[PDB]
C-alpha cells in the first residue's frame, strides 16, 4: 500500500499549498534594520527593524525595535492595510493616521495609497486580483483531477493535472509584472534602504507548478505508451 499513500499525499500537498499560498502574505518580502524617528512630539530616535510583506490583498508593516524596551516603551507593531475589492486603502490609512502609529509605518503605508506619485496601488490591486482568481481556477482543476482519479478514464485526470500546474504558473506570472515599478519607488528609511524581492510564497508556487506539470507529462506518457 506504500504507493497509494504517496499518491494521496502528493495531491493533498498540492491542494493544501494552493489554499495556503492564496492567503499567505509573503509574495514580496523586504527587511532592514535602521535608525528611524519614533513618533510625533518627541525628538528621540529609536533603533528598530522595519519590514513589509505584500500578499495579493494588502501589506503588513512590522516595526519592532532592536530591544523591545526603548523609551519607557515596548515596540512590536504589525499593521495591515488591505486594498482588495472588499475593503479600501484610503480609509484604512486615514483611520490609522489618527491613531498615531509610529512614523515609518505611516511612511511605508502612504506609498501604496491611491493617487500617490509612486503609483503602487493600481498595479498591485490588479495583480492581487488576477493572480488570486487564477489560484481558484487552479483549485477547481485540482478537485476535478482528483475526481477523475477513479473509475473515469485516467487520461482526462492527467490532462487536468496538467491544467492545474498550468494555471498555477499563469497566476505566478501575473505577480511578476509588479517588479518594474516597486524597484524605482524609493523606500529610504532614515539612512537605510528597504529592498523588496520575491518571497517564499512565490518560489513554493513555482515548485508546485513544476511538480504538477511533470506529474501530468509522466501520466500522459505512461497512458500513451504502457497502460499499466
Amino acid at each position: 500500500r506504500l504507493f497509494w499513500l504517496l499518491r494521496v499525499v502528493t495531491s493533498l500537498f498540492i491542494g493544501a499549498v494552493i489554499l495556503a499560498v492564496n492567503f499567505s502574505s509573503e509574495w514580496s518580502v523586504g527587511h532592514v534594520n535602521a535608525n528611524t524617528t519614533y513618533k510625533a512630539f518627541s525628538p528621540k530616535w529609536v533603533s528598530v527593524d522595519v519590514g513589509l510583506q505584500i500578499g495579493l490583498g494588502g501589506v503588513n508593516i512590522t516595526l519592532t525595535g532592536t530591544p523591545v524596551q526603548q523609551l519607557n516603551e515596548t515596540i512590536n507593531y504589525n499593521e495591515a492595510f488591505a486594498w482588495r475589492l472588499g475593503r479600501s486603502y484610503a480609509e484604512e490609512y486615514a483611520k490609522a493616521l489618527e491613531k498615531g502609529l509610529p512614523d515609518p509605518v505611516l511612511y511605508l503605508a502612504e506609498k501604496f495609497t491611491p493617487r500617490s506619485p509612486c503609483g503602487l496601488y493600481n498595479q498591485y490591486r490588479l495583480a492581487g486580483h488576477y493572480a488570486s482568481a487564477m489560484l481558484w481556477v487552479a483549485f477547481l482543476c485540482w478537485l476535478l483531477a482528483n475526481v477523475m482519479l477513479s473509475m473515469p478514464v485516467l487520461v482526462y485526470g492527467g490532462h487536468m493535472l496538467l491544467a492545474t500546474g498550468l494555471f498555477q504558473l499563469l497566476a505566478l506570472f501575473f505577480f511578476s509584472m509588479t517588479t518594474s515599478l516597486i524597484s524605482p519607488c524609493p523606500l529610504r528609511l532614515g539612512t537605510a534602504v528597504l529592498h523588496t524581492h520575491h518571497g517564499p510564497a512565490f518560489w513554493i508556487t513555482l515548485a508546485t507548478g513544476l511538480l504538477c506539470i511533470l506529474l501530468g507529462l509522466v501520466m500522459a506518457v505512461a497512458h500513451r505508451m504502457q497502460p499499466h
Binding site: 525628538p43 493617487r115 506619485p117 496601488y121 481556477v137 539612512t191
Partner: protein, 1091 residues
C-alpha cells in the same frame, strides 16, 4: 542617534498642535468667517436670474487700459511672490467630482468668445473639491477643502507629502533632484506628479519642459517658474554650503539641515517683508506660541488675496542684467506664456538670472478694478476652449464656494456699514464715477447683493481695501500665532537665540545676490519697492503698444480624426456573421469534395399545458432580472456619477448584462442527459415536458443572442460617449483607471475596444458567437454533422472569456460566478456519469427497409446485456457524421436472441441512417444499454388495461410480446390493449406485430381494440372470421374511444380493481384519468406510464 537634535517637521502638516492634530493638513476643510450663502442653504449656488451674468459683470467694470502705474511703486516681483506664498497656503482649484458643472453663459455678440453673433455659446466651468462629511442639511452646508498644508512651512518648495518630497529629491547629499543643468530641476519625474496643461499659444502638452516643483501648478507662467527656481537653487546652495563645513554628514543630516533654514528664511520674508508692503502696515509683534488659535484658511481669504492680486499683473515683463540693459520687443508678453514648455529666451541659468532682475525693477499696474486683457480675455481655459475669462471665473468660484455678499461680510467683521453705492469709494465718486452707476444698474440698484470680489476691487483705491486688508492681516496673524514650528518660537528647539537674529535680518536682496551671484549694488535694499534712487530705472511704463499679439482662440475638438476609423471598426463588428457565413459555405462546398379554429386552439391549449408554463416562467425570471437593474440604474443613481453622462446606454446595458448572465448559465441544465433520463419517469413529467429539452435549448440560445446584440449596441454608444468626455469626468466615472492631470485629452475609441479587458474579451466573444451560431444552424448541420460538432465545442472558450470578461471594476463587481456555480457543477457531474460507463459496439445483423420511413434494424445481444420490456437505448452510427447519440425504444421481447429497433424517419440524422443501410447491414453501431425504471406493474393486477396512443405506442410491441411469452410458457388474466391513433401511417409494423402476437396467444390472455379517430380526410386506409386486408380478428372502430361506458360495463362482464396504465398525448392521458375517476365512486389505479 545622529545630529538631528529636534523634531523633523512633517510634510502632510499633521500633528502640528498637541490637542487637535488635523488643523493644518493636506485635506482639511476651510472654515468660514460668515456662514454659507448657498441658494437653498445646503449646496446650491446663486445663479444668473438672481445675480448678474459673470461675463456681463466682467466687461462693465473690470475692463480698461493697461498702462497705469502703481501708487506705492510696488515692483512686479511682489505681485509674483504673492502668487507663490498663496500657493504655499491655499489651493482650492482642482475640480473635485461627482462631476458637477456650472457654466458661464456668454452674451450675444461678445467680440472675443462669440464674434459671429452666433446666438448662445457656453463656456464651461467645474466645481471644486468638497468635504464628503458636509453638505447634507442646512445645519452643516457644503465645505470645500484645500489640497496643501495650511501652514507657511514651505509646502510649495518641498511638496505637501512624503511620497512627493521623495520623487523630487536626489539623495546625493541634501539636494533636490536637478537635471542636465545644475540650476534647473528634473523634467523626468514631471509626469506623475505635476500639472501639465497644453500651452494655449501653440498647443503642445507633453511632460518635456514641465519642471518638478512643490506646487502642483508652478509652471502657470515663466514668472512663477522664475521663483520656484530661485528657491530650488537657494536650497541647493545652502545645502552644498553645509556640506563643506561638516563633511561627515550624511545625505539626510544635510537635507534636514538645509530644509529648516530655507523654511525659516522663507517665513521671515513672507511675513515681515512682503506683508508690510502688500497692505502697508507692519504686523504687530510676535507673542508666545498660542496653542489655541485656529489656523484654518477661509474662502474669504482666497478671494481677498489670491484673486485680488490680479489687479496689478502687467501686460509684459522686462528682462535686464547686472548693468541696466533691458533687452536680455524686448519684453515677453504674458498672454502667450501660459504653461510655456521651452521658452527660447529662458533656456539657461543666465536667463532666469535676468528675468528676476527685470521683475525687480518694473513698476506693476495700479490697484483698482481695471484688470488687463491678458487675464480677462486670454486666460488658459480648463476645458473645451483655449482661452477663458479669468474674472468671470473668479465670480463663478466665489458663487461656488458660497462666499457672502459685500455688506454681510463687512458687518460680520466689525467694519462700519455702507448705505448706498455713491459711498462705496468716496474718492472714486469724485472723478469718473460712471463705473459705480454702471455696476449699480447691474444689480437693479440693490446694494445688498454685491459679491465679495467686485466690491473689494471697487473699494481698493491705492492699497487693498479696508475689507481685504483685515481679512489678510488676521489670517496671516493666526498663521503664525498658531504655528508650532514658527522659527521665532523658542520652545521647539529648532534655532538658537542668535540664529534667529540672523534670519530676522535676511531680506530678498540677500537671496538674489546669493543665488544669482551678483553684486549687492545691482539691486535695491527693498526689492518690493522702487523709490526714485534705486539702480536700473525702468525705461517706460509698459502699455500694450509695441508688444506681440495674443494667440487667438481655438475650440478643442475631441473625436476629430477618429470618425472614419470608428465607423469602420463598427462596420467590421457588424460583419462577423457575414465572414462566418461565407466560411461556412466554403466549408460545406469543400466537404462535398469527399367554427373549427376555436376548437383547434382548444386542442392546442389542451396538449401544451406544460410548455407554456415553462416558457412563461423562464421569460418572467429573465424579465425580472432585467427590470431590477433597469429600475435601479434609472431611479437610484449611486453618487449620480455615471447616471448623468450616459442615461440610456447604461440601462440598456446593465439590464441585458444580468439577463444574459442567467441565460448563458442556465442553458446547461438542458443538456444534462443523465438527470433528465431519471426525472422524466418521476411525477414531474406531468408538469414540465422533458422530451422537449433540445427544443428548449434551441429556444434559449435564440433569445440570448438578441439580448447580447442589445448588450453590445449599448456599449458601442457608451464607448462613443466616453471618447468625447473630458478627462476630468472620466477620472470620476472610473477612478483608478484614469487620473486627472491637465492634459484633458482622453483615450481614443480603439483604446476602449482593443486595449481593455472587457472590450477585447467582448470582441472575442462576438467572434466566437458568430462562429458557433452560424455553424450550428440547420442548413449547416444537415449539410455536415462534423462542422457542427467541431465548431460547437467553443462553449468552453466562451465560458472562460465570460469569467475573464467581468473580472474588472469598471461599473460593478463580477456576478457571473454566482449564476454559473450550480449549473456548471450539475452539468459536469452528469457529464462524468456519462463518461464513466462503457459503450459497447454491436454489428447490425439484418436491417431491412420497411415502408413509410420505419427501418427495422436487427443486431445481436451482448452477453452482459439484460433489459426489461419497455426500456430504450442510444445508438450512434459512425459510417457518416460524428459520435452523435440518439435515443430509441427497443421493440423486441427480452426472451428472443437479437433485439430490434424500428426507426421512424424524422430528420437529418435519421434520413442519413436510412440512406446508409439502403438495400443490404454491413456497418456497426454503439449501443448504450437500457435506460429507464422498466416498470412491470401489470403483473400484480388480475386484469390490466393498457391504453397507448399516437407516438407513445412504440414501447408496447415488446410489452405485448413479453406478456404473451410469459402467458404461454410459464403456464395478468385478460390484459387489454386499447390503442387509439390518428392515421396509422408509420405504425404499420405494429399491425403485423399484433398479428404475430394474436397467433402465439393460445390462452387468450390478450384482447386488442383499435380506434382510428379521423373525419373523412382519410385515404380510405383500408372472410375466415378475419379481415381480408390485414388478416386480424379485432374490430377496428372508426369512431373515438368510449372510455366511461367501457369501464362502466366492464364491471358487469367479470366481478374483479384493475390497472388502467396509459401512455400518449396529454389530451388522452387526462381523459382516461377523468373517465376512471367518474366511476371510482363505485365498485382502477389509472397509474400513468411514460416509457
Amino acid at each position: 542617534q545622529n545630529s538631528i537634535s529636534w523634531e523633523v517637521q512633517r510634510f502632510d502638516g499633521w500633528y502640528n498642535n498637541l490637542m487637535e492634530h488635523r488643523w493644518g493638513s493636506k485635506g482639511s476643510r476651510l472654515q468660514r468667517l460668515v456662514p454659507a450663502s448657498y441658494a437653498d442653504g445646503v449646496y446650491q449656488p446663486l445663479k444668473e436670474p438672481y445675480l448678474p451674468n459673470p461675463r456681463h459683470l466682467s466687461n462693465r467694470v473690470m475692463r480698461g487700459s493697461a498702462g497705469q502705474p502703481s501708487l506705492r511703486n510696488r515692483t512686479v516681483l511682489g505681485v509674483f511672490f504673492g502668487y507663490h506664498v498663496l500657493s504655499d497656503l491655499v489651493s482650492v482649484e482642482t475640480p473635485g467630482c461627482p462631476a458637477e458643472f456650472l457654466n458661464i453663459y456668454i452674451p450675444h455678440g461678445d467680440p472675443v468668445f462669440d464674434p459671429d453673433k452666433r446666438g448662445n455659446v457656453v463656456l464651461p466651468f467645474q466645481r471644486s473639491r468638497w468635504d464628503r462629511n458636509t453638505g447634507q442639511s442646512p445645519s452643516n452646508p457644503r465645505d470645500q477643502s484645500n489640497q496643501v498644508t495650511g501652514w507657511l512651512d514651505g509646502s510649495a518648495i518641498y511638496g505637501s507629502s512624503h511620497s512627493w518630497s521623495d520623487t523630487l529629491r536626489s539623495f546625493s547629499g541634501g539636494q533636490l533632484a536637478s537635471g542636465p543643468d545644475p540650476a534647473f530641476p528634473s523634467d523626468s519625474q514631471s509626469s506623475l506628479l505635476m500639472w501639465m496643461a497644453p500651452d494655449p499659444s501653440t498647443g503642445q502638452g507633453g511632460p518635456r519642459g514641465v519642471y518638478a516643483f512643490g506646487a502642483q501648478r508652478g509652471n502657470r507662467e515663466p514668472f512663477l517658474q522664475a521663483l520656484g527656481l530661485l528657491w530650488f537653487r537657494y536650497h541647493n546652495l545652502c545645502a552644498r554650503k553645509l556640506a563643506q563645513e561638516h563633511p561627515h554628514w550624511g545625505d539626510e543630516e544635510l537635507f534636514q539641515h538645509a530644509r529648516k533654514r530655507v523654511i525659516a528664511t522663507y517665513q521671515n520674508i513672507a511675513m515681515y517683508e512682503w506683508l508690510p508692503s502688500f497692505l502697508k502696515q507692519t504686523p504687530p509683534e510676535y507673542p508666545g506660541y498660542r496653542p489655541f488659535l485656529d489656523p484654518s484658511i477661509s474662502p474669504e481669504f482666497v478671494v481677498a488675496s489670491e484673486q485680488f492680486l490680479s489687479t496689478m499683473v502687467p501686460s509684459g515683463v522686462y528682462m535686464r542684467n547686472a548693468s541696466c540693459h533691458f533687452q536680455g520687443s524686448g519684453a515677453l508678453r504674458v498672454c502667450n506664456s501660459y504653461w510655456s514648455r521651452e521658452h527660447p529666451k529662458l533656456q539657461r541659468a543666465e536667463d532666469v538670472d535676468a528675468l528676476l532682475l527685470g521683475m525687480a525693477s518694473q513698476i506693476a499696474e495700479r490697484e483698482d478694478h481695471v484688470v488687463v486683457e491678458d487675464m480677462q480675455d486670454f486666460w488658459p481655459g480648463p476645458l473645451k476652449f483655449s482661452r477663458t475669462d479669468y474674472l468671470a471665473s473668479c465670480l463663478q468660484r466665489g458663487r461656488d464656494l458660497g462666499l457672502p455678499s459685500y455688506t454681510k461680510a463687512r458687518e460680520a467683521l466689525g467694519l462700519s456699514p455702507i448705505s448706498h453705492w455713491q459711498d462705496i469709494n468716496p474718492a472714486l465718486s469724485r472723478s469718473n464715477g460712471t463705473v459705480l452707476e454702471a455696476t449699480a444698474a447691474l444689480y437693479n440698484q440693490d446694494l445688498s447683493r454685491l459679491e465679495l470680489l467686485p466690491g473689494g476691487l471697487l473699494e481698493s483705491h491705492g492699497d487693498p481695501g479696508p475689507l481685504f486688508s483685515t481679512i489678510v492681516l488676521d489670517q496671516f496673524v493666526r498663521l503664525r500665532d498658531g504655528d508650532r514650528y514658527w522659527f521665532e518660537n523658542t520652545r521647539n528647539g529648532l534655532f538658537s537665540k542668535e540664529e534667529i537674529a540672523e534670519i530676522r535680518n535676511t531680506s530678498l536682496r540677500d537671496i538674489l545676490v546669493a543665488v544669482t551671484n551678483v553684486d549687492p549694488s545691482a539691486l535695491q535694499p527693498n526689492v518690493f519697492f522702487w523709490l526714485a534712487g534705486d539702480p536700473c530705472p525702468q525705461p517706460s511704463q509698459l502699455s500694450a503698444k509695441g508688444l506681440p499679439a495674443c494667440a487667438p482662440l481655438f475650440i478643442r475638438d475631441y473625436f476629430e480624426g477618429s470618425g472614419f476609423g470608428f465607423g469602420l471598426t463598427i462596420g467590421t463588428l457588424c460583419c462577423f456573421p457575414l465572414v462566418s457565413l461565407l466560411s461556412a459555405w466554403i466549408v460545406a462546398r469543400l466537404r462535398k469534395r469527399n367554427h373549427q379554429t376555436v376548437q383547434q386552439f382548444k386542442r392546442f391549449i389542451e396538449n401544451y399545458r406544460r410548455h407554456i408554463g415553462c416558457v412563461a416562467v423562464f421569460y418572467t425570471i429573465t424579465g425580472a432580472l432585467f427590470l431590477e437593474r433597469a429600475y435601479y440604474y434609472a431611479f437610484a443613481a449611486h453618487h449620480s456619477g455615471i447616471t448623468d453622462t450616459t442615461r440610456v446606454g447604461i440601462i440598456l446595458s446593465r439590464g441585458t448584462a444580468a439577463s444574459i448572465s442567467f441565460m448563458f448559465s442556465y442553458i446547461l441544465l438542458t443538456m444534462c442527459r443523465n438527470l433528465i433520463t431519471f426525472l422524466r419517469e418521476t411525477f414531474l413529467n406531468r408538469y414540465i415536458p422533458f422530451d422537449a429539452a433540445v427544443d428548449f435549448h434551441r429556444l434559449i440560445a435564440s433569445t440570448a443572442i438578441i439580448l447580447t446584440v442589445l448588450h453590445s449596441a449599448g456599449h458601442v454608444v457608451n464607448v462613443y460617449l466616453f471618447s468625447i468626455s473630458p478627462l476630468s469626468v472620466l477620472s470620476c466615472l472610473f477612478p483608478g483607471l484614469f487620473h486627472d492631470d491637465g492634459s484633458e485629452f482622453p483615450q481614443k475609441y480603439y483604446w476602449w475596444f482593443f486595449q481593455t479587458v472587457p472590450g477585447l474579451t467582448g470582441v472575442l466573444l462576438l467572434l466566437a458567437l458568430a462562429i458557433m451560431y452560424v455553424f450550428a444552424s440547420h442548413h449547416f448541420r444537415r449539410r455536415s454533422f462534423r462542422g457542427f460538432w467541431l465548431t460547437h465545442h467553443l462553449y468552453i472558450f466562451l465560458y472562460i472569456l465570460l469569467i475573464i470578461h467581468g473580472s474588472f471594476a469598471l461599473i460593478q463587481m463580477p456576478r457571473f460566478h454566482i449564476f454559473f456555480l450550480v449549473p456548471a457543477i450539475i452539468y459536469v457531474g452528469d457529464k462524468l456519469v456519462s463518461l464513466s460507463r462503457k459503450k459497447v459496439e454491436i454489428s447490425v445483423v439484418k436491417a431491412e427497409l420497411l415502408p413509410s420511413g420505419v427501418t427495422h434494424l436487427r443486431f445481436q445481444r451482448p452477453q452482459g446485456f439484460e433489459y426489461k420490456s419497455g426500456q430504450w437505448v442510444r445508438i450512434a452510427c459512425l459510417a457518416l457524421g460524428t459520435t452523435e447519440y440518439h435515443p430509441f425504444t427497443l421493440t423486441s421481447a427480452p426472451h428472443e436472441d437479437t433485439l430490434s429497433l424500428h426507426i421512424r424517419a424524422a430528420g437529418p440524422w435519421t434520413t442519413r441512417l436510412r440512406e446508409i443501410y439502403s438495400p443490404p447491414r454491413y456497418p456497426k453501431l454503439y449501443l448504450d444499454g437500457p435506460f429507464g425504471e422498466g416498470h412491470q406493474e401489470w403483473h400484480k393486477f388480475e386484469v390490466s388495461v393498457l391504453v397507448g396512443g399516437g407516438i407513445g405506442v412504440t414501447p408496447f410491441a415488446s410489452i405485448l410480446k413479453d406478456l404473451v411469452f410469459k402467458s404461454s410458457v410459464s403456464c395478468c388474466k385478460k390484459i387489454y390493449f386499447i390503442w387509439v391513433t390518428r392515421t396509422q401511417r408509420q405504425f404499420e409494423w405494429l399491425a403485423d406485430i399484433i398479428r404475430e402476437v394474436e397467433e402465439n396467444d393460445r390462452q387468450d390472455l390478450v384482447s386488442v381494440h383499435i380506434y382510428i379517430t379521423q373525419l373523412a380526410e382519410k385515404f380510405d386506409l383500408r372472410v375466415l372470421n378475419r379481415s381480408l386486408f390485414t388478416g386480424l380478428r379485432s374490430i377496428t372502430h372508426f369512431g373515438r374511444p368510449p372510455f366511461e361506458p367501457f369501464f362502466n360495463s366492464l364491471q358487469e362482464v367479470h366481478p374483479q380493481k384493475i390497472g388502467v396504465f396509459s401512455c400518449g398525448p396529454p389530451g388522452m392521458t387526462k381523459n382516461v384519468e377523468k373517465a376512471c375517476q367518474l366511476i371510482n365512486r363505485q365498485d382502477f389505479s389509472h397509474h400513468y406510464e411514460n416509457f
